[PDB]
Amino acid sequence: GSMQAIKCVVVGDGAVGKTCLLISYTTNAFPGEYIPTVFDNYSANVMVDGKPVNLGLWDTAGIADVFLICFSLVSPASFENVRAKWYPEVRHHCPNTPIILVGTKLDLRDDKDTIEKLKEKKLTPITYPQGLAMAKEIGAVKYLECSALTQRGLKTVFDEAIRAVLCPPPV
Numbered sequence: 057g058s059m060q061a062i063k064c065v066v067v068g069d070g071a072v073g074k075t076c077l078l079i080s081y082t083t084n085a086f087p088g089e090y091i092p093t094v095f096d097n098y099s100a101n102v103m104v105d106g107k108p109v110n111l112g113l114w115d116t117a118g119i120a121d122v123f124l125i126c127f128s129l130v131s132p133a134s135f136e137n138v139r140a141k142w143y144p145e146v147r148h149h150c151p152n153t154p155i156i157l158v159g160t161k162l163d164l165r166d167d168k169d170t171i172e173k174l175k176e177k178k179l180t181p182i183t184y185p186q187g188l189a190m191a192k193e194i195g196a197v198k199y200l201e202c203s204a205l206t207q208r209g210l211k212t213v214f215d216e217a218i219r220a221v222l223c224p225p226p227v
């Protein structure tokens with residue numbers, strides 16, 4: 057053993073939950089404490105489809121094998137920036153590198169008070185069909201929703217980032 061190294065770079069607007077996504081996945085605990093930019097990258101040794109992989113995860117302020125573009129499901133402004141900023145920025149460096157679109161803070165999309173404070177701003181959470189359509193719009197290989205807090209959807213984000221590298225499409 058013998059494992060494949062895969063580099064994954066995580067981008068998206070400020071406060072969408074990139075750091076908490078990576079820490080929750082790699083330590084299995086949502087961080088209830090301050091996180092100094094001491095760490096800009098995290099690591100996980102994972103088995104996907106019977107294949108041992110060293111997943112290297114690179115965090116940013118909001119050569120990759122795969123990118124995660126993240127937006128908060130309760131921030132329409134972060135969602136618009138997926139196509140306005142993050143997709144063009146990734147594609148200038150890397151025309152072909154797969155992208156996974158990730159909607160974060162899934163626990164808040166059905167949260168009553170987060171729905172109610174948005175409604176004061178004539179905003180509403182991003183729905184699953186809207187996210188899926190934005191993924192098609194930016195040519196993302198997959199669209200996934202997750203909560204770092206509850207860990208719902210969290211493992212699948214990384215499993216899919218890995219499958220995107222290990223199993224590229226025909227062509």
Ligand SMILES: Nc1nc2c(ncn2[C@@H]2O[C@H](COP(=O)(O)OP(=O)(O)NP(=O)(O)O)[C@@H](O)[C@H]2O)c(=O)[nH]1
Pocket residue numbers: 068069070071072073074075076077116117118160161162163164202203204205206
């Ligand atoms: N309810 C909920 N809050 C979350 C979740 N993930 C992160 N948060 C909260 O969202 C805020 C931002 O999280 P953080 O991971 O620091 O975001 P970031 O994208 O790294 N920010 P930056 O780009 O500035 O470094 C924090 O208050 C954090 O607790 C989640 O899944 N659910």
Ligand SMILES: [Mg+2]
Pocket residue numbers: 074075076115116
């Ligand atoms: Mg951060």
